[PDB]
Amino acid sequence: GHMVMSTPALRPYLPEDAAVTAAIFVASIEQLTADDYSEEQQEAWASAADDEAKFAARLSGQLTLIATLQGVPVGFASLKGPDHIDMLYVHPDYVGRDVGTTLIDALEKLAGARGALILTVDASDNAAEFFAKRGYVAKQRNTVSINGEWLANTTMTKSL
Ligand SMILES: CC(=O)SCCNC(=O)CCNC(=O)[C@H](O)C(C)(C)COP(=O)(O)OP(=O)(O)OC[C@H]1O[C@@H](n2cnc3c(N)ncnc32)[C@H](O)[C@@H]1OP(=O)(O)O
């Protein structure tokens, strides 16, 4: 037997959500990535929320959904263009609750409804297994340069 999770509510990202989104993003990175990323890597990755206008522009100019529980934002994800999973960040206090899964299902429905046949994500090493269990297949190991740091990830694709 297994526990049955509730599905969180999802709503589009609003300009007023700028700060809570940046807060979920940095807390998710700090607290959930230690086994695959060193102190300095995590700091460069998180530092993206530093440029507030540009962090908010990336969100507002993409298809960005916010997961809520009791109306409190606990996670968000972002589709870029037709077929890129650009962002997936669940607050560290709310992981293991099918928030990530709910968010990603919404992005795949949204992307299918836009023509896309092959969804793609550059998955962080800690989220690699998560994506693989949902039919994403590792295609290419990469390094990304972020704020003067190098961080590994893997391009993984899913047929819709
Ligand atoms: C492009 C990008 O943005 S990639 C970068 C991705 N982001 C990050 O790495 C930031 C740090 N990480 C995170 O924020 C999160 O760990 C995420 C986003 C990867 C996933 O968020 P979560 O809400 O924990 O995902 P969710 O709960 O749907 O599933 C995670 C696991 O918990 C499990 N789970 C869910 N509910 C339960 C439960 N009641 N009992 C046991 N296990 C459970 C799922 O089976 C799943 O297993 P898997 O890892 O084998 O797939």
Cα–Cα distance measured from residue 133 to residue 129, given in angstroms and rounded to the nearest whole number: 6
Alpha carbon distance 26, 89 (integer Å)? 9
d(CA 27, CA 69): 17
Which amino acid would we find at residue 62?
Q
CATH architecture under which domain 1-160 falls? 3-Layer(aba) Sandwich (3.40)
Amino acid (1-letter code) at residue 9:
A
Dihedral of alpha carbons 119, 124, 125, 131, sign: negative
The 8-class DSSP code of residue 5 comes to P
At CA 95, angle to CA 20 and CA 80, rounded to 5? 60
Residue whose pair of structure tokens reads 């990202």 in the numeric block: 13
What does the block give as tokens for 111? 């992307």
Work out the angle at residue 108's Cα, subtended by the Cα atoms of residues 102 and 110, and round it to the nearest 5 degrees: 100
Instruction: Give CA–CA dist 73/66, Å, rounded.
Output: 6
- Edge-to-edge, what's the strand order for the sheet holding 72-80? 9-12, 63-69, 72-80, 84-90, 118-124, 149-159, 137-146
> What is the number of residues in the chain?
160
**Ligand 1 center to 68 CA (angstroms):** 15
Indicate which residue's Cα is closest to atom 25 of ligand 1.
Answer: 100
CB 106 within 8 A of CB 10: yes
Euclidean distance between CA atoms 109 and 103, whole angstroms: 10
**Residues within 6 Å of ligand 1 by CB:** 3, 5, 28-29, 32-33, 85, 87-90, 95-101, 121-124, 126-127, 129-130, 133
Taking the CA of residue 88 as reference, the ligand 1 atom at the shortest distance is: 3
Spatial separation of the C-alpha atoms in residues 14 and 93, rounded to whole Å: 22
